[PDB]
Amino acid sequence: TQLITVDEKLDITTLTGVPEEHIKTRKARIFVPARNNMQSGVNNTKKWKMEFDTRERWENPLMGWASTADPLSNLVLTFSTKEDAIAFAEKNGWSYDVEERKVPKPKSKSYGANFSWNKRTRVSTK
Template sequence: MKNVRIYPQSKSQAQSGRGKASVWIIEPEWTSSRQPEPVMGWTSAGDTLSQVNLKFSSQSEAEEFAKSKGWRYTVTAHHERTIKPRHYGDNHVYDPDVEK
């Protein structure tokens, strides 16, 4: 039985919109420790499944797939960003407590 993690894909730093924000990923949990290679210094692992990510269009699809394979899974909740409404003029308000 395999342990997997289900989480929503975060947006790229170069991405300003929220397109493709509904993609959910199944990623296997590491079963072996990571160790640096003595010659090149690259990080390696004993299992190749750590390189596999499965993408789904919804959380329920990802959970159904994990259940059908008999995998134990943990779901990481979707992080919603908080937006503080501000006006453009607030950028130019004088505040004596702020040093420039």
């Protein structure tokens, strides 16, 4: 009711109990995941995935597994806008990198363009 409020940023790493080593050490990455190109389906777009950097993964000497001393290794954070993505990355204290979304460029194709008269565009095989 028009109360106390100050206008400042947020530093939630004092609250969430995380080690400051894993705060100042690592660095987030915010990106739209590129389409797995062997498939052709663009539903895997329309997100904003936040990952962390990959780190040390040695081998289990007894079996031949993959062991790591990395607690923040296998997270991913699905967001829906870059604005609140960068806002959250600022808000929870860690540093971050911002890649940029690259759309499929629209084109101009026709079967009639494939079957021209003098133009060298000619499929010659179908």
